[PDB]
Amino acid sequence: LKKYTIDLTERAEQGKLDPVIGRDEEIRRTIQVLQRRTKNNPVLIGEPGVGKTAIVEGLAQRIINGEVPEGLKGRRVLALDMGALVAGAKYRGEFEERLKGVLNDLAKQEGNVILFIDELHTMDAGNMLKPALARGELHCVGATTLDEYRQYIEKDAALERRFQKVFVAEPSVEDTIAILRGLKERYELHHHVQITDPAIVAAATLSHRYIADRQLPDKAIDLIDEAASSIRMQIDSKRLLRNKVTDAEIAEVLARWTGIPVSRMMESEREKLLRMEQELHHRVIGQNEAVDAVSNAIRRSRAGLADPNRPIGSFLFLGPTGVGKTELCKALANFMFDSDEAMVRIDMSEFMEKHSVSRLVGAPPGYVGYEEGGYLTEAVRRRPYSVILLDEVEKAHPDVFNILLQVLDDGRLTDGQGRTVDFRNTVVIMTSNLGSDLIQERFGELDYAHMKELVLGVVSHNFRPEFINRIDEVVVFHPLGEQHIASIAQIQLKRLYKRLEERGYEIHISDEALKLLSENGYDPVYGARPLKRAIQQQIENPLAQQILSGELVPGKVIRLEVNEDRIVAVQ
Amino acid sequence: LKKYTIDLTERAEQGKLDPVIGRDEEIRRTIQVLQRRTKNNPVLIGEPGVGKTAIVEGLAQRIINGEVPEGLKGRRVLALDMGALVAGAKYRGEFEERLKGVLNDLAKQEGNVILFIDELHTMVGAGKADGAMDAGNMLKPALARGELHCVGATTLDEYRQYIEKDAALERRFQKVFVAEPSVEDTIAILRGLKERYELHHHVQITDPAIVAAATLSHRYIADRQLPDKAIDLIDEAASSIRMQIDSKRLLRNKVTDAEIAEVLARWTGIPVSRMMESEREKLLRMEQELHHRVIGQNEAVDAVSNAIRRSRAGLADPNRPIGSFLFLGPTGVGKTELCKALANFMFDSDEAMVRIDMSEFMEKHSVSRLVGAPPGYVGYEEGGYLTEAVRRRPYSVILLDEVEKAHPDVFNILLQVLDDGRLTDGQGRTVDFRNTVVIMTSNLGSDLIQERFGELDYAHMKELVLGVVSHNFRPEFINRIDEVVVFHPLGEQHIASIAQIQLKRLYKRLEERGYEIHISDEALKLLSENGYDPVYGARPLKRAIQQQIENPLAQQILSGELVPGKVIRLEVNEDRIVAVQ
Amino acid sequence: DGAMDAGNMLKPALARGELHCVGATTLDEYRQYIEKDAALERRFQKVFVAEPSVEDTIAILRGLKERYELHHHVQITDPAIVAAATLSHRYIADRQL
Amino acid sequence: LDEVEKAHPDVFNILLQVLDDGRLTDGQGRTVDFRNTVVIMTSNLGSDLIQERFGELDYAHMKELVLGVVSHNFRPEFINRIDEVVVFHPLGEQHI
Ligand SMILES: Nc1ncnc2c1ncn2[C@@H]1O[C@H](COP(=O)(O)OP(=O)(O)OP(O)(O)=S)[C@@H](O)[C@H]1O
Ligand SMILES: Nc1ncnc2c1ncn2[C@@H]1O[C@H](COP(=O)(O)OP(=O)(O)O)[C@@H](O)[C@H]1O
Numbered sequence A: 001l002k003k004y005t006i007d008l009t010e011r012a013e014q015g016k017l018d019p020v021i022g023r024d025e026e027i028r029r030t031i032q033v034l035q036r037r038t039k040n041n042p043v044l045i046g047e048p049g050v051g052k053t054a055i056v057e058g059l060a061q062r063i064i065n066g067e068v069p070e071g072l073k074g075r076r077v078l079a080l081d082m083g084a085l086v087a088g089a090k091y092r093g094e095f096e097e098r099l100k101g102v103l104n105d106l107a108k109q110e111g112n113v114i115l116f117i118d119e120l121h122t123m124d125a126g127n128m129l130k131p132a133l134a135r136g137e138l139h140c141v142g143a144t145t146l147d148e149y150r151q152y153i154e155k156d157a158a159l160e161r162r163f164q165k166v167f168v169a170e171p172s173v174e175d176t177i178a179i180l181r182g183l184k185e186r187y188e189l190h191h192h193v194q195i196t197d198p199a200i201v202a203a204a205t206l207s208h209r210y211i212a213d214r215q216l217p218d219k220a221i222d223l224i225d226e227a228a229s230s231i232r233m234q235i236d237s238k239r240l241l242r243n244k245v246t247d248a249e250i251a252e253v254l255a256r257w258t259g260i261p262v263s264r265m266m267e268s269e270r271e272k273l274l275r276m277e278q279e280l281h282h283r284v285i286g287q288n289e290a291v292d293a294v295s296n297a298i299r300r301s302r303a304g305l306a307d308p309n310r311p312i313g314s315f316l317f318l319g320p321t322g323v324g325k326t327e328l329c330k331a332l333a334n335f336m337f338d339s340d341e342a343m344v345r346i347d348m349s350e351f352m353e354k355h356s357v358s359r360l361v362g363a364p365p366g367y368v369g370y371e372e373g374g375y376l377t378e379a380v381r382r383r384p385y386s387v388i389l390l391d392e393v394e395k396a397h398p399d400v401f402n403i404l405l406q407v408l409d410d411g412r413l414t415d416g417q418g419r420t421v422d423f424r425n426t427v428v429i430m431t432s433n434l435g436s437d438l439i440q441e442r443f444g445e446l447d448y449a450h451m452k453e454l455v456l457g458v459v460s461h462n463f464r465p466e467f468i469n470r471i472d473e474v475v476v477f478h479p480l481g482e483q484h485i486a487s488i489a490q491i492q493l494k495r496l497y498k499r500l501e502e503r504g505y506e507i508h509i510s511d512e513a514l515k516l517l518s519e520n521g522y523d524p525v526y527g528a529r530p531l532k533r534a535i536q537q538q539i540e541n542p543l544a545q546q547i548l549s550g551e552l553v554p555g556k557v558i559r560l561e562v563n564e565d566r567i568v569a570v571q
Numbered sequence B: 001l002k003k004y005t006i007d008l009t010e011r012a013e014q015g016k017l018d019p020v021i022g023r024d025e026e027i028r029r030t031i032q033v034l035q036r037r038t039k040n041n042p043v044l045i046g047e048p049g050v051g052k053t054a055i056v057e058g059l060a061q062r063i064i065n066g067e068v069p070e071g072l073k074g075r076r077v078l079a080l081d082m083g084a085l086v087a088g089a090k091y092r093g094e095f096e097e098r099l100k101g102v103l104n105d106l107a108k109q110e111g112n113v114i115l116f117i118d119e120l121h122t123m124v125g126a127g128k129a130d131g132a133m134d135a136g137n138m139l140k141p142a143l144a145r146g147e148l149h150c151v152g153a154t155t156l157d158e159y160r161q162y163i164e165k166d167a168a169l170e171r172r173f174q175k176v177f178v179a180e181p182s183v184e185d186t187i188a189i190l191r192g193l194k195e196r197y198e199l200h201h202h203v204q205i206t207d208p209a210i211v212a213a214a215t216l217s218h219r220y221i222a223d224r225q226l227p228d229k230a231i232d233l234i235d236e237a238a239s240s241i242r243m244q245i246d247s248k249r250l251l252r253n254k255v256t257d258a259e260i261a262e263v264l265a266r267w268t269g270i271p272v273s274r275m276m277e278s279e280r281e282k283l284l285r286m287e288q289e290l291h292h293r294v295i296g297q298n299e300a301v302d303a304v305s306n307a308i309r310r311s312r313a314g315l316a317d318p319n320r321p322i323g324s325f326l327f328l329g330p331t332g333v334g335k336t337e338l339c340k341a342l343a344n345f346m347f348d349s350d351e352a353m354v355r356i357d358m359s360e361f362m363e364k365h366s367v368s369r370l371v372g373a374p375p376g377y378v379g380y381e382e383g384g385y386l387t388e389a390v391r392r393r394p395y396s397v398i399l400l401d402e403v404e405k406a407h408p409d410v411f412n413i414l415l416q417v418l419d420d421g422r423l424t425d426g427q428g429r430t431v432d433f434r435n436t437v438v439i440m441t442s443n444l445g446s447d448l449i450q451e452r453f454g455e456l457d458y459a460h461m462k463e464l465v466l467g468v469v470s471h472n473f474r475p476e477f478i479n480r481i482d483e484v485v486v487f488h489p490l491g492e493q494h495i496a497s498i499a500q501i502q503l504k505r506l507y508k509r510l511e512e513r514g515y516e517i518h519i520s521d522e523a524l525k526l527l528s529e530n531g532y533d534p535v536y537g538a539r540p541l542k543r544a545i546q547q548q549i550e551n552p553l554a555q556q557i558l559s560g561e562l563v564p565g566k567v568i569r570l571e572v573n574e575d576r577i578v579a580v581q
Numbered sequence C: 001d002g003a004m005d006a007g008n009m010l011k012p013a014l015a016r017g018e019l020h021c022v023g024a025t026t027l028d029e030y031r032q033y034i035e036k037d038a039a040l041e042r043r044f045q046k047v048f049v050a051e052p053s054v055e056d057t058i059a060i061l062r063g064l065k066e067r068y069e070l071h072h073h074v075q076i077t078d079p080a081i082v083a084a085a086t087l088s089h090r091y092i093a094d095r096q097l
Numbered sequence D: 001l002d003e004v005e006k007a008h009p010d011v012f013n014i015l016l017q018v019l020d021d022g023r024l025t026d027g028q029g030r031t032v033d034f035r036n037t038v039v040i041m042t043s044n045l046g047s048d049l050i051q052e053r054f055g056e057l058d059y060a061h062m063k064e065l066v067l068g069v070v071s072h073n074f075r076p077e078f079i080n081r082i083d084e085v086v087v088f089h090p091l092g093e094q095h096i
């Protein structure tokens, strides 16, 4: 009288119920599937929350209270017994006599009571229950993932005659909100535990902004119970306690593997004075042309106002290439993602094949290579975070020109196989390499508001008037002078400093000594690409010549001399 | 034997088997094979959901009820499962002791047992690990000696690449082809099976919901086979109504075709559900509902709305698409816009218009991009641009844009879609255009269409343009077109009515932001000077919002007097327009 | 035949309720050796904990050096501690920090 | 990696991870560090372009001439991850 008897009258006697809130059009689906006789086995597929707990607690609520009479109620079904199957059985084959005895002797009353079985994926998933499922015995409620469903339950053929994929879509933030609405039946009457409104949402907002590889509600019910365990054990660690529940309880639990505090995890209405001066302006004091996209074009995007089907956050940003684009697309990702993952560069410069059809926005059939294709074909299926560049589109023959008009408008959203692409959180920096190549020489009297109307007015509409008729905001990047790269040639040398103090050499360099490099440094054609090899050929390959020779001993700082026709820093 | 093989014959004595209706030529041919001396092994070759598992359940019901010959009288139909034989077979020859345990129990039965191996292809290469196969190589002597009576039931392409590759096992089975029943042959299937679903659901199922469970399944569900979806639909509908009596004559239990097409609209997306909607309001106003978003073009809508009424009355050719149109005429007149309207009428989504631009098919090598590459060539398993798109949406308006810019050898690809509604892919699969509307815009006579529209009233643009310059020299393509449609160019009467739905669909959301604008009547001809074009058409009107109305807000930010919240006007002056707060 | 249940026997303390577990073991050996036993990993939920850092294992090495200075009778110098954590992290790849 | 231009272009995506990070994923999912190897790729893409170098090409413009022929064969993300593209001159009479 122990194993195969579960009485569901007890569930209101002990309060053993965790109520489901949010899923009703995805659980009444698993009562539509279950009520059939062909394919009457719902297997619940996806992220958690249901798992044979929504149909069993959402079943006694409509019978015992008494709005409907007794001539209609009577759908009293039962639930899973799984615990004592493998445990307590010793032999080979005498384990099997318990599983055949649990299904055959529930037929003592000619089908008076029916039964569900839960969580069938393991193999008990079609080795000992397969005649028990094919004989039309009783119907069960499965629960798999999506990939473990196509491991076991769909490349079979005799099992999908009864099972069918029931997918649940990714849930709200209000999943654990009502978990702590009812559960004060157990918390305040005997322990007086309060958890405030900004403390339930705090452990649940971690999905669309913080980390998006993991599901929400597994990360919500566990990071509240650890934050609520504060009082009874920190009083046993051998004005007294904040009884006002704030963001502090979750932050001790959440930030014990990151290192970033509360201060930028709840970016809010007044927090936008605090999110101006954190990481963008300590690595470099500057790069304040692109701060406009987070100041005036941010009000209609992050307050529930992001309309994806017309560009509102698309602030246009121009310049040359290799000159500061790729760092800011990483440093704005460093300002957002707390790390480095934005690797995007698109140029239409030096490739002449018929493969420029797939680099647009995807390949229609008749091609080779859909797995990579173009770069933007793969940059949403990898992860939805990428900052799209557009360079050097102005050179090919004019049959290829006007295909840039189709994506920027509200005509069709242009995905590839049925799942979405990014329309809301992308700043597009493009590159203008028209006659701004002779202007890079001097930094005296450069135009900010004389540049784009009188220079561009007479040079654009001779060959093509359909390019700048839309695009008009032109402001230049930094002109390549002396001291603005003397900061940049210090950034690449200070990662040579840390490369060198690991072996005991601290090298200094003067304002005179690093503009010795500037005669062999930058290129107006490539940007700041020949800066790094100029560090190798001028100092770093002569430096390793002297570290190995032993004439630069660790400990003594060395200075330079001006000398004969090859310029190296010797004693 | 009793550990693996489900006994179908004692599952028929309890009444647990589905009543099998019909199949008496495929059951008799099965018994004709099951009574052979050697190789008495039928294989019920069909397709998924044809009824080949419910043929042996109509053979096992037949042995008990006794309509079998003497010789099959009193047999047992055991349903061997090759998934329960490779179930826990970890070690060496744990599988082979399961067959040779089953095969030696079948020899103790001295031929009184029929063995139903459902899905024989799961037997080809079962416990195969070491080398030589172990399931259809252990049965191979007792299959050829006429010893174990093996009713197989596989599908035809699972027979083709599993059982036909073992040519020594392919001969031990006799193909009893189970063709799927027709739409009238599955009503009698479902008329007798309806009571087995009435007793399970406690739900009354009318034969109106059964005569329409099969005509709507066959017409609209094309991937499945017929007595699998027609019984899926009634089981889904009886479970949809089983909610309405549990929780919350007018609280009904009856299934009618209202509930059957509602489940099928919830499956595929075709809303032909009930005419108690505004469809009675819609079926004769089918020509003027297009006029809501196709301004003018009375010859255009009376060709497309009369052709898609011709098929909703069941009167059109079922070996031909719903409409085959040649929309030759000027650019920006209602050519591409009507097909969006025709998709937003028939399949009520203008995203169901498969636009194909035939300037991408300028040269002759680029014709296997539409139809698919042959076997062995690049882009074979990808498919074609037209055939795979119609396999995505078989219910779509195909727009073939500027077909005069195609190669002449792409109209040859487009002779079979028009004549028969078929196009074979490069992989030998045929796609079915019988539900699509193939509309083909062109600019081949547009120089002579535009000059004579206010001269030759409504019919002489059709005649006499064909033969001097236009398409008659390649004559096989003209007569396959359903209606050749010429487009009269737009005057000022239409572009005033065409330039009113620019923001009409976005109008129904953006009121509380601070925008509601009524019609201003002074800047009407500012857009009617660049937009109303006799030569280039009304397509520069879409740039006449991107160039005329939307400019001095989104770039005039930094000066510091114009801020949004005030609705702009336009008046006829030399203004460089102002905006007062 | 009837054996092979060293962990199965433990679970009659889970029938008691007395069975308790803090799984700290090899992760992929926790996957394929706890394969069929769902009654050993009932709701043991994914909470992060693994290898440290280079400056975290310098504190490991600085407190453990007295066991290695007295086993070998050498004087492990604090440059050798930092260089053992930085260079092994950089160069040795198959091993953990 | 000699005769590198004869490799299929799906081998350069595998080779790119070597020059990007120093890592390369084994087909069993093992990460192999290449940060202490010297990876040399021998190719002759600009073969008939260096045979005319003896007139007015002293390895500065000649480096950019062969990197025009090579950029038609290798991806631009691949060539920038190469530390040093080296152009070999043809051997004179005194070298033989
Ligand atoms: N002639 C028939 N009379 C009565 N019921 C039928 C008939 N044909 C099919 N059915 C029923 O319709 C369904 C058809 O499924 P099956 O009989 O298994 O066909 P099937 O060919 O085996 O499909 P698969 O893909 O191989 S499982 C079952 O529920 C049958 O009971
Ligand atoms: N919508 C929801 N309503 C109520 N509880 C939820 C909801 N979503 C998640 N949960 C909680 O999250 C936990 C998920 O755990 P579990 O159901 O074991 O995961 P799985 O479904 O993957 O087996 C449950 O304990 C449940 O209480």
Ligand SMILES: Nc1ncnc2c1ncn2[C@@H]1O[C@H](COP(=O)(O)OP(=O)(O)O)[C@@H](O)[C@H]1O
Pocket (backbone or CB within 6 Å): A321, A322, A323, A324, A326, A327, A345, A488, A492, A526, A527, A528, A529, A531, A532, D080
């Ligand atoms: N703020 C900056 N100002 C100038 N140059 C920079 C800055 N940040 C990075 N760089 C330079 O950009 C170079 C990389 O540019 P390049 O290789 O031409 O383009 P990409 O990285 O997009 O391929 C680095 O060598 C670095 O010196």
Ligand SMILES: Nc1ncnc2c1ncn2[C@@H]1O[C@H](COP(=O)(O)OP(=O)(O)O)[C@@H](O)[C@H]1O
Pocket (backbone or CB within 6 Å): B293, B294, B295, B296, B297, B331, B332, B333, B334, B335, B336, B337, B498, B538, B539, B541, B542
């Ligand atoms: N007969 C018409 N009815 C309704 N709108 C029209 C008509 N003719 C032109 N238009 C408008 O003109 C625009 C034409 O744009 P576009 O599609 O670029 O031209 P085309 O159809 O020639 O390719 C459409 O957006 C449409 O709103």
